[PDB]
Amino acid sequence: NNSVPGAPNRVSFAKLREPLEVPGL
Amino acid sequence: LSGLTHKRRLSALGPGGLSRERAGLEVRDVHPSHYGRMCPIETPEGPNIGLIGSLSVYARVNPFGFIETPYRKVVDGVVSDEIVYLTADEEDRHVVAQANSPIDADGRFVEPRVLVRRKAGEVEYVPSSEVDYMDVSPRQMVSVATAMIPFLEHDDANRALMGANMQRQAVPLVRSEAPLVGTGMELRAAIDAGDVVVAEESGVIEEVSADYITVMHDNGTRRTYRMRKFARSNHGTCANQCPIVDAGDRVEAGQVIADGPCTDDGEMALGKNLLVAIMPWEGHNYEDAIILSNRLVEEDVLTSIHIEEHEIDARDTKLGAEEITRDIPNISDEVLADLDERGIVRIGAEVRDGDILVGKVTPVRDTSLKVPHGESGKVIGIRVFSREDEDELPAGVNELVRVYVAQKRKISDGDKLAGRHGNKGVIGKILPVEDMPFLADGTPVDIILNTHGVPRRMNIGQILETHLGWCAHSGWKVDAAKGVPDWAARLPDELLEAQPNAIVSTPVFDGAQEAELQGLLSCTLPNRDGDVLVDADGKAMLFDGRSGEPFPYPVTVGYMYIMKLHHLVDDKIHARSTGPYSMITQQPLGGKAQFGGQRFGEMECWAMQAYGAAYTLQELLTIKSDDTVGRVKVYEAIVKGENIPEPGIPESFKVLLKELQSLCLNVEVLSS
Amino acid sequence: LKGKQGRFRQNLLGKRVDYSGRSVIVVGPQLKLHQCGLPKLMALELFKPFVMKRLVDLNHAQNIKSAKRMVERQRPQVWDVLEEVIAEHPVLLNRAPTLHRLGIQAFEPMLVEGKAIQLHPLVCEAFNADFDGDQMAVHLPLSAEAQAEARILMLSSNNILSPASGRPLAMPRLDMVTGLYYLTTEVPGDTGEYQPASGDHPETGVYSSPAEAIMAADRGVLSVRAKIKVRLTQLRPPVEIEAELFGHSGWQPGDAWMAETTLGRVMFNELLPLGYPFVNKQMHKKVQAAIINDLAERYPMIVVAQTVDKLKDAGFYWATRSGVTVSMADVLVPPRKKEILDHYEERADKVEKQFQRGALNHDERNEALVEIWKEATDEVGQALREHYPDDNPIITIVDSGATGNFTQTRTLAGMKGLVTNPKGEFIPRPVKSSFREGLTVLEYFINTHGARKGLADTALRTADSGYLTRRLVDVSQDVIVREHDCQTERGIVVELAERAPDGTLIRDPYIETSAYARTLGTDAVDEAGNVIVERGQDLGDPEIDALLAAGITQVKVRSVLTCATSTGVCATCYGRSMATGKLVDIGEAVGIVAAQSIGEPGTQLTMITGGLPRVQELFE
Amino acid sequence: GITKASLATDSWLSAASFQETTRVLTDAAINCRSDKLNGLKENVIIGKLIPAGTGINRYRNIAVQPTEEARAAA
Amino acid sequence: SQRPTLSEDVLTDNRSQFVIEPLEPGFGYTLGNSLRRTLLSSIPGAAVTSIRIDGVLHEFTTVPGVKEDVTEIILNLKSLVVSSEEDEPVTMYLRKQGPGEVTAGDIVPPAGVTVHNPGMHIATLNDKGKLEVELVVERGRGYVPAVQNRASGAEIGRIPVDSIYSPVLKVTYKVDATRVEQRTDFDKLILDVETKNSISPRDALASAGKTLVELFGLARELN
Amino acid sequence: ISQRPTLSEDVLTDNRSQFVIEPLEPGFGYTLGNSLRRTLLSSIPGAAVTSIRIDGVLHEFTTVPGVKEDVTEIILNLKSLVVSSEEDEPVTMYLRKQGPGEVTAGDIVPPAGVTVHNPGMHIATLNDKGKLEVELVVERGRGYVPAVQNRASGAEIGRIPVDSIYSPVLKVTYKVDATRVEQRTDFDKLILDVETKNSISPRDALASAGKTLVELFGLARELNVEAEGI
Amino acid sequence: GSERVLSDGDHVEVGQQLMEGSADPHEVLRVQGPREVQIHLVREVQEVYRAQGVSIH
Amino acid sequence: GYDTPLGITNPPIDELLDRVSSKYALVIYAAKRARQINDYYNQLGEGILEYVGPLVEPGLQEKPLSIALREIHADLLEHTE
Ligand SMILES: [Mg+2]
Ligand SMILES: [Zn+2]
């Protein structure tokens, strides 16, 4: 679910899914 | 990160707003309607507390100016994927659920009673039907800076605020490294930070270079990006860009192409990874001090670059126009050996404190610009603006020239360091690499932290961070032949098998639990020598470097992220014995740059009076501040072997007389 | 002349002086008490004229200008003279902003590399300094007069006793106390302990002298803290044994006696000054304070400083090996917290239903909830304390008085409990988790308020205390001890210790302050004709003990309040000084000392209010 | 109170230093109030040695010479 | 009962184990620690001192054709390891032009010096640019700040570089004790040392032994 | 590199001493100090007593008849006795007296070789019609060895092993001090402190320790050939 | 005893406060003299300082 | 009856106070002697004498004030109140 094309892969202690990406900061 | 936070800031003072003295104290406190709009943690430490907040992660301003916040509306007890944005008033008039409350995959509430937030400061369980709104993510109330502090749910409010404020003071290093443990909001906070370029259209790179890049679009249009190298930042630090792409790769649109300062492969990196140990060590780490191995100094692990900046100008005058010229009256050839024909120092020439940096003549006197007190380094570039070449200049000037001096600073004694959990410190002493304690396999540690400061400050999060960092660094492999252990039920199926120097990320308010760490620490991969260093608890057996015998008890070790603050030591240190004197007040100048003495407050006068010391106070007030002839005579006597003559009449008292005599008040002396 | 910039006022705000310098401070444990470290890059630039003169004297240069040029260029011919020219030249340190008398010391310099002004650990409390970026200036006396001034009066080794009360301030403070506690602690059933003769086997655990004990401990057959029976030879035994074994004939070096203690206690007692009776009890911080006070009240200051330095060195050495660390396995959760929380939550539900009936209002519900949750927090804290053994580093740190309290440990392991609100009233919503287990979003949001309020409170308190101190210093500038003795008779009478109707004597809980240092007005002759304390003789710890032994209750004591001197006060009336330990010397200012002492504690004064405003109103 | 106790003193210079400089200066000027340099505040404003500690005349005027016994034995 | 110690070697690819026994009780730890301390800081070696890049006046800049600036190549060159046989500053050359990669094996050392790791990656070049770098190799021990060359007052084209003369990388020891009640109570020391391949472990151990022997010789003389 | 030679100074007292080495390269302070202390403390060979016997007592719980002192006090007093031996084999020694009076170490009859360096030392005192016979064995060794290591020893009636002290030195302590030989101003200045028995002089014990340590490092040096500074 | 209530018809000593609070220094001074007000001020300030736990002579 | 100190604290402070009346007198009582010693040193190229030189034999380049304090401890000076 890496939105950017080629970001480094770092698995996360994910338990819940956020239904929207962070809006443009 | 500092730039992004400043761009996202929310001020409350200034023109058109309340002042410091008139603003009430209650306004500086939280309000139950802040949840989702303004972060409650991030705030300046100074007196401007509560008047400067920061937008929440998901907050977006409505077209009128009322902050909003996303929500998904539950219709009949079933969660809705579609989302809407609600303002404060509409938020009050509804029921807002809890994101962390368990929810079934089908949208069914497993629990009949789910906690909830109500009108104001009211929370209470309610049946699982009347609930109307549910939040989106657990991280919906944190600021941008606070969103990247791992294990934020374990620290204290003050400590979390201190760490968040500290994160905005790092210094870009020379060779950055991504943190081993950090939230998933690092790369996103960097792409939007603007300080990293990114391709617009999916193309294939033809060639790359240290100074520029050329990517070929799929439509046949060649485009080029220029990357500024070693350009002084707005605050004195350096900025660069080093492309991370190879020749002949079809780079997709939106893929980072260059890493700016504090970046590593398109993600924030404000510090390095050091092997820490927690134990009081011969009092050198007493009361927040810190000890560093010389390996950091000799390997440029924490070496930074700082670029100074100076400028001189030749502005016209009624008596004539000043001109920069190589020649200067009554100066030896050696002194001006650096200046070139045009009258400026050649590029790439070392400059020492007190040296001449650019020569000019004043109608002729000498007023050349010289390096201030306490600067050194190379000269990287010179910019000269000339009115002849049709270059806009401020009115009344002809030639303004600025010179950049860049110095490489290696971390030394008296420098600040701090983790992400707000635990400051100073480098008490840098022992040789042969003296630090070393693991059972010969791996000397790099930094030692005190332990008495952990439980009083109550920032236990950093201990968990250290444990997880060691676990991630060494790599783990959880047993699964007999089946997933009960403590490993909720772990992602792809997180059970890691590699050495693996990368992990724990989102705020949703991360590895204590059971997860307990299980992981029991399955770390063995060292190449075949043995495992740390125990299940996380402690290890060390070996003293001085005595050479093992410590009686095990100690904790692990990799913890360490930044570097901007409060360096070279800026602070300063001395002054004799130098330029002010002309209007007859007092020595002030400030490090001007080479001036220190201030002597009245409290020092009270302290001196308390001890009964009289002559010392007399000296401090008369012979070293005001009396001109006194200063000259004492300096001459010291140069010779003669005793210091008694001080005279201070200039302040004589000025007071000659001023009070002007109001017709005949002020006599009555020496009798 | 008038206003803030009026030349009258601006003459008092201070002037910018020469021969100065500021830098960061870093603790250094390798220095004696009367010592400090200066970076060479600062010392060479601050001693320039002396170096130039002494160098031209040695014929390394021809004139003064050439010597100055060479000093600027820093040739290798200068460092030797720089070391030779600061042999015994004192310098003055001043942490900004200085607050009290002890805020300006005078240390001997010592060259050391780096760019930080090293310091001694035991003096940081005098400056209230924290080694997290604080900066202090460095002045230097020039004339032959200021040198003696700063060498005799302002020296650091001569100001162990704080001016507030005549009790030492420079004492083991934060870390070394833990080392001493570990060293002097006793444990049963250790390795190599003493045992009794068991039939055919002798009694083991007896060593001829501490040397053999140290060797055995080094070899690895004797833990440093175990019950032993050593045979000391250079430590006066406790009076209870001195008067019995030797029949009061008097111990002298060279007389042996069989002690029963642990090697750690002997190694600790070896640090104390010779002749002091053996001390054979575990060293809680209170015991440390008592021992240091006794040493300061029975021996000269220099011996106290030397023994304090040695004790600090030993504490630092032995703190590292105490094995005090922090880990997840150390912060241990309570075993049965869940059942107690369930029961208290059930009772909370009961009162909730009671309110649902509608009989009670909101206020009664709030009161019931707050009291219930306070009781629950107390119960959980009791259970948590009953759970932890005496080996966890947290318990060892907290119980030994090193720092902190038990409430912080309860928060870190048990329950944080109800938390304050912006209005100051306790929210009806209590947190049910500890920082170890992990909070939730709502609880943290609720918790933020206390931190915000505390920050604001400190921010206002600092300025309030500063203003109060300034005013108090302003009022009493011109009090100075002029005459040696007013020869007056009016002496305020203070009840030393009351005699209980059933008991024989009860020490007044404030004898430590009212009549501890004042000069005794009239002799307190016992019921019989014998005189226990004679007229004029200053009071003190041994004399206070003697008075208590005599059973005297009411005593008339000479005071400064009724002093008959036209200006200032008579010295005999003022009584025993604070920093000197003896009668005040003629000419010493007392007004400034009093103002500083009364104003310094203003920082911690917080809330008819009872805080600093109360004192302001009272004095006004 | 402390304020009223400190506003009324004997030396005019310190009083002018504290508050209402013009009024007290005028009042002192009319009376020709000549004051000795007594106290610390005025004595430190002037710059002369403070009359406290090592400044009192009882100690500022001391003559010290080696005892005749030492002089006899060099 | 009483025998002098003896030192033997157990060999591996590049890290060797040394076994010393029998030693008197409570004495192995101190000896091992002393050897480790004298091994990691007082072993003579040689390393690059200062470089000279043609067409470049200082270090805070770049050069056309390369992918990384001067600082990165300096950092990479710090990893270079060389051994000096002559006791004077010698000079090497590094000339590589055209597209491709430039490694440690492209240096042409003079007589009396060698580069033992030709596989290191220095940088990469695009066809546009070329490169010619001259570097010095002096012999020292310990560690010296780069600024040493700043005061020499050379021309502009000289760039100082930090020198790190140390061939040893890691050292560790464990003691195998025998605490039986018999008079065979001794301990066996197991010292392991690994080098940067500049010198074999035996040479470094011999150098450390000689250093300590010469240092302790000052006490054996009758006082 | 020759660097700068390191000279060993010296100070004198009744039987103590403060040997000083100055200056040393940065970090060599402890490198010398710790190993030198350990060698001094547990390398120098010596002689001492190992076991005793009292035919007047069957075990250790009680005390010998007709003597003021207790068995444990007797053991402690007899342990501190300084005995020098030149014969490897364990030889015996006898102490016998009769009638009231005191007993001194000098009154013990020594066989060939062994000697006692303190004859005026007190052991115990006897009342009227008192007697005690002891047969203590003496052995040569190094360092400290507890009696537990001598527990299993044949089969006898009243063998009571005592913790021996096989060393002429019994106390050592050292520090490190900074020094300024140049702009470095970090060179270490070792300060040793030794206090030996009467059977050896400190300047000789230190010399023997240095001899042993140099002989030990001769193995390290001998593996190859390579030189260093003074 | 402090627990006792203010009972009418009893007797009191001169200068004592009848109810909780603070007595104006002027009144106690005029009705007692300087000594009583001095000691009362000293005791009150000492009490307020002893409240926080700090100690001064 | 205590370990000999090192540094500027030798001689100690209490020993001096037994001689001088009060600590405030001692500072001047020593500073004036230091001034006299410095004056004696200054007239060393040619001989003009106003006061004698050090009584106790000095060390190796010791500050004059140290000599003054170390000779006051020996009870070799007499002063006027
Ligand atoms: Mg601080
Ligand atoms: Zn009086």
Numbering used by the authors:
A (entry chain c): 29 to 53
B (entry chain c): 446 to 808, 832 to 1140
C (entry chain d): 406 to 1012, 1024 to 1036
D (entry chain d): 1209 to 1282
E (entry chain a): 4 to 226
F (entry chain b): 3 to 232
G (entry chain d): 1094 to 1150
H (entry chain e): 28 to 108
Paper quotes:
Analysis of the cryo-EM images revealed two particle populations: RNAP monomers and O-shaped RNAP oligomers (**[Fig fig1]**). We determined the RNAP monomer structure at a nominal resolution of 4.1 Å (**Figure S1-S2, [Table tbl1]**). In the cryo-EM map of the monomer, the σ^B^ subunit density was absent. Thus, we concluded that monomer particles comprised mainly the RNAP core. Overall, the structure was similar to the published structure of the *Mycobacterium smegmatis* RNAP core (conformation 2) with a ~5 Å bigger distance between the RNAP β lobe 1 (β-L275) and β’ clamp (β’-R214) domains. The β flap density was absent in our Mtb RNAP core structure and in the published cryo-EM structures of *M. smegmatis* RNAP core and holoenzyme. These observations support the notion that the β flap is flexible and can adopt closed/open states if not bound to any partner.
